[model samples]
Target: APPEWDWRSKGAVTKVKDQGMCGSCWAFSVTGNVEGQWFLNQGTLLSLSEQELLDCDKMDKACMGGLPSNAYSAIKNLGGLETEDDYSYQGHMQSCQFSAEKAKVYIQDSVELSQNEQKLAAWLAKRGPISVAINAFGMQFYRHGISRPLRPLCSPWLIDHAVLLVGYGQRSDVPFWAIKNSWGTDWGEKGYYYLHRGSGACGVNTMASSAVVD
Candidate 1:
C-alpha cells in the first residue's frame, strides 16, 4: 500500500549501503536514491539490485567504482530499476537485459542531495527523511553497545555507509540528529543513533554534505 502524504508530495531519501569489499558506493548512492524516488512518485518501490547496474551498466567501471551520474544515465536510458522486495537484495549480481519502460520508470530526472550542512537540521525537520553517508570504523561494524554521544572514531580508511536522518533536535540532553540504520534491530538505540549537531565525522561539511530528494 502507498503511504498518504499530507504535503501532497513525496520524494526519495536513501543511504548508500557499502558494497562490502567492493568499491561500489557510487552505485549504492545512485540506486538507493532512484529506488526511493520511484516509490515516492510512482507509489511503488522497485527491488533493483546494485549489482545489476554494476554488471550491466558498462558505461562506468562497476567493481572499480564510478559516479552517480553513470547510474542515473543507465536507468534513464534503460528505463528504471526494481524494488528490493521484487529483485531481492544482493551485494552484486549479473546484469539482465531490460527496458526502462519494462522496468516501469515513471520519472526521468534524478534527485540531487542538499549540499548545505547547516541546513541538515532544517531539511530533516521538513523533509521527513534524509539519506546520509558516514565513515564507519571497524569497531562500529561489530560493536556490543552504542548509547553514547557521536564523536570521532579511528578508522584506517574512510568507509561509506548510508543511514537515514529521521529527525533532528536533542537527545540525552544533547542536540543531535536522530538517525536510523539498516543493520537490523540489534544495533545502536534499537537500530538507531544520534549524531551531534556540527559534527565532521558524519560528513557535516557544508560543501560535502548531501541528500537525494525527488
Candidate 2:
C-alpha cells in the first residue's frame, strides 16, 4: 500500500457542497475535482460553478442525472468554467446562462483510472482529488464510521451517485478512502464519508477519473 495520505492536510480539498434535491452530484463531483486540481497547481482555492454545467451543458441531463466524464467534456468544450460567484447553484435547473468569457479555469483533459487501489492512491497523491461514481443507496442514513454497503443486493451496475475522492489512510487495520459528498456538512463525517479501501467498495474503483486543469 502507498503511505497513508490526506489531501485535507495539504489543503487540496474544498468545502463540502450540498446538491440539494437535484441529481446534480455529477456536477458537484466534477467541479470539486477540478477545484482541487486548480488549487494544487496555482495555490488558489476556487469554488467553481456546478450550475454552469447544470444549465449549459447540452450533452447531459440537467437535474435528472449525468456523468462526470460528460460534465468534464462539456467544461472543456465550452473553453472553461466560471467561478461560483459568476454562475451560482440554484439547486434546480435554469436556462443556459453560462458566460464563457468569464470562465476562470480550464481543463486540459481528464483521464480514466485503474481499478487497482495502489494505482488510485498514487494518482491521487500526485495529481490531487478525483471524481468517482458509486452505489450510494446505503449512504442516506450514514452518520459516521467507515461506510461499506450492507445491502446484499447492492449492484455495481447500480452506481448512481458521484462524489469526490479526497484522500486515503488507515485506522488500525481498517484502511479507508476519504471521500467528500455533496450532501452538506450535516450528513456524514461533516459531509464526507470514508469507504473501506482496496476492495473496489461500491464500484468506486470501477469509475474513478480526474480532470487535468490549468
Candidate 3:
C-alpha cells in the first residue's frame, strides 16, 4: 500500500453543479479549476457554466468526449477566457468565435500519474484549485442522483472524471482524499469522498507527472 495521504475539511465548497448528462467532462474539469482559482484570486466563488465553453469554444467538442489537457491547450492557444457570468455556459456551445483574448488561460501542467495526486492535493491547499482526472465507474452513469455513501460504480477502470481538490485529510483508520463532485451536495459526505491514499485507483502518483499553472 502507498503511504497514507491526509485530508482536511476545505469548508463549504461550491455546490455540485450539474452537467445535464453530457459527456463533455472537459468542461467540468476546466470549470472546477476556474472555480477554485476565482476563490483564491478574487476571494469569491462563482458558479460558472460548462455549457458556455461547449457552445462558444468551437475547438471544444461536445458529448463526443474530450480531454482536459486539450481544453487547457485550447484556452492558451486562444489567448484567454472569461468567467461563466461573462459568456455563460450552454452544455454544448456552437463555436469558439468570440474574442479569444477576452479569456484568460489558467496555465496548468499535466499530472502524469496517480500518486502525483498527493502533491496535487498539497499544491491545491496552497495554490487554490487543481484539475484532476479520475476513473468514474460506468455505474456512475446509472446514478440518476448523487448519494453521500460510497456508491462504488463497479467498472473496469476509472472513466476519467475531473473534479476540484478543495481539501485533503484523513478519515478513520484509512487515509483518503476529498473532492467536490457535480452530483450535487446530496452525495458523498456532502459532495465529496476520502479516496484510499495508496489505492492508485484515484490516480495520485508523485513520480507520474507534475504541473504548474499561473
Candidate 4:
C-alpha cells in the first residue's frame, strides 16, 4: 500500500462537508478527522460538529479561524464534541451550545505526525484521514487533476487553510495527495483537492495531525 490508499472507499470517511464562507477551516478540519477516529477506534462512524468549536472554544477566535492542534486542546477542555444532528452548523459564529451530557465522542489527545512524507503516508493508510494545512494561493481556480503549482505560487510559509488528507495515490502516472475540503461537494470536484504528492507541495505535511481515541 505504499503507492496507493483511500479511506473513503473503506467506510471510515464521511460525506463531503461544507464550511460556507466562514474562516473556520480549522474547525471542520479536526471534526472530520475525529469522525474517522471514532469509526476506526470505537467501531462507529458518527459525524461530529464544527459549529461547536466556532461558538464554544474560548481559546480560539470562532469563525475568525484557528489551528487543529489548538482546537484539539479546546475540545479536551470543553469535554467533548456533539453529534451534528443537534449542534448543526450555521456558517457563522453563534452562542456556545455544546453539552457534555449530549457529547457523542471524545479524544484522549492529539497526535502531530512527523513532517516526513513517508511516515505521513504510512500512518494515513493504516490509521485514518489526517488533518493538514497549506497555503491556498491559486486554489480558487483549481479545476481538477494533480495541481503541481510552482513554488512561488504556493509558498509553504503562507498556509491559511486547513483540510483533511483522505487518500493518496497516482492518477495517470501522476502521484497525488487527495484531500477533502469543507467548501462542500459543489466546489471543484465535490470539495476535493488533488495536489502533487511529492516535494511537499503546498505545505501539505506542515500541519499534519490526528486525534487519539480510546
Candidate 5:
C-alpha cells in the first residue's frame, strides 16, 4: 500500500458534520462510510440522513447509542436512506419521516473488516473509508499528535464512540489512522482525529465495518 490514502482528497467525503448533543455518532459513522461507498460506485457524494436512523431504527437507542452493524440493517430494512436534503439532521430524534421513495442510496449488505491495521490500510486504499468504534473514554483531555491511549485505559472491549476511518499515513515515522469525527470542525484536526495505528491503539481496529454499496 502507498504511504497515504484519503477519501476527502478524492471528493468522496462530504463536509465535516456535527452530531450535536445526540449520541448519534454511530449513525454519522455509518452514513460517512456509505457516502464514500456511494460516491465511489455511483459517482455522487451526498450527505445521508442520520435523523432517519435516529428516528426509524428502534433496534438501538435514538440519542443514547447505536452500532454500525445494526444501523446498516435498519437502513436496508427501511428501504434505503434519504439524502440529508430529504431528511435533515435535527440533532435529536423525532418521529420517523423516512420515505422509501425518497431514499437516494441503497446497500445490499455490510462488511466487517480485518483487525490488522495493514490489511485495513489496504482495504481502505482500494475500497473506501470504514465505520469504526473506538474507546474514547478520555478523549476530552486529548491534545494534538497521534493518540495512543494506554491499553489498560483504552481496552478494545471498551469501544464505544463511533467514527469514520477516512485515511491513514505516518507523521514523522509514527503511523496513524486519519479519522473523520462527528463533533464538527472545531474539534480535533478540523473535524478529524488521528489515532496511533499499530497495536490496535484505542481499539481502532476492533470494530471496523462498512456499508456495502453492491
Candidate 6:
C-alpha cells in the first residue's frame, strides 16, 4: 500500500495564487509544479514567474488557455524563468519582459502519467506535484466540502481546467487527492480541493503530467 503523503505538510507545496478573471489556470498549474520541483531539488522554495509564460510563450494564448507541456518547453527554450518578485502577475496580457539572465530555474522535460490510479500515486510520491486538467464548470460555486461531482458532467472527456496535485490520502474508505488551485485562498478549501481518488474523479486521472528538473 502507498503511504499517505501531503506535500503541503512537508512544505513542498507553496501558497495558492489567484488568477483573477484571467483563464490562466494553465500558467498557475505549470508554475506550481515547477515550484515544487525546485523545492524538492534545491531545498528552497522560489516563486517562479507565470507572467513570463503568460506573456512570452508565443505558442499559447495569454489569459486564454495553455498546456503544461508547452509551458515546460517554453521555459526550456527561453533558457529558464525568473522569480515572481521580478515578473509579478498583472492578471492581464502584457508585452513580454522576459530577461534570460534573470532566469532562476529550468526543466529538462515533462512526463505524462498513466491513467492507472496506482501508477499516478506512485509517480507523485517519487517525483513531486503533478499538473492535471479536470472539469471545472462546477468549481466556481465550490466553497467548501470534499468534491465528488455527479456523473456525466465529471467524465474524463470533460477535462477543461488545470490544477496541481499536491498530495493524496484516504478518509476511511473515501480516498481523496489534495489539489492546489489558482483561484486564491478564498475559493475552495483554502484554495485547495479534495476530490475522490482512484475513480478518476473530475477527469483528474485523464490528463496527469509533471515536469522533471535536475
Tens digit of per-residue lDDT, candidate 3, span 1-214: 2243222234224566666657776677676776665556555566655655676555657667666666656655555556666666555546554564445435344444345555656665566655566666622543322212242553324446666555555655555555556666565665564455444543432222223344
Give per-candidate clash totals.
9, 0, 38, 0, 0, 0
Q: What's the lDDT for all of these models?
A: 0.51, 0.87, 0.54, 0.89, 0.89, 0.86
Lowest summed lDDT window (length 10), candidate 2: 148-157
- Which stretches of candidate 5 lie above 4 Å from their native place? none
Per-residue lDDT for 104-213 in model 6, tens only?
Answer: 88888888889897888888887888899989855867776667887786777877899998889887778888889998898789899888888777789988887888
Better of 1 and 2 by lDDT: 2
The residue-by-residue lDDT of candidate 1 on 102-174, one tens digit each, is 4544336554455554565564444445545555552265443322324446321354554555555544455
Q: What's the TM-score of each model vs. the native?
A: 0.62, 0.95, 0.69, 0.97, 0.97, 0.96
Better of 1 and 3 by TM-score: 3
lDDT of 5 by residue, 57-147 (tens): 9998988999889999999899999999999899888999988789999999998999999999999999999889998864666656788
lDDT of 4 by residue, 1-214 (tens): 5689989888988898888878989998999999999999999899899989999987878778898888999888888999889899898889998888999899989988988888888999999999999888756788877887889889888899999999999988988888998888887677799988878888888889999997
Residue 180: error of model 3 in Å?
1.3
Q: What TM-score would you give candidate 1 relative to the actual structure?
A: 0.62
lDDT of 2 at 30: 93
Candidates sorted on lDDT, descending? 5, 4, 2, 6, 3, 1
Q: Write model 2 residue lDDT over 1-214, tens digit each, in one string.
A: 3578778878888788888889999999999999999999988888999999989988889899999889989999998999999999998889988776898899999989998888999888888998999899668778888877754645667898999889898887798999999989999998898888877788888899988865
lDDT of the structure predicted as candidate 4: 0.89
Off by over 4 Å in 4: none
What lDDT does candidate 1 reach at residue 200? Answer: 47
Question: What is residue 203's positional error in candidate 3, in angstroms?
Answer: 2.9
Higher-scoring candidate on TM-score, 3 or 6: 6
Instruction: Judge candidate 6 against the unseen true structure and give its global Cα lDDT, from 0 to 1.
Output: 0.86
Clashing pairs in 5: none
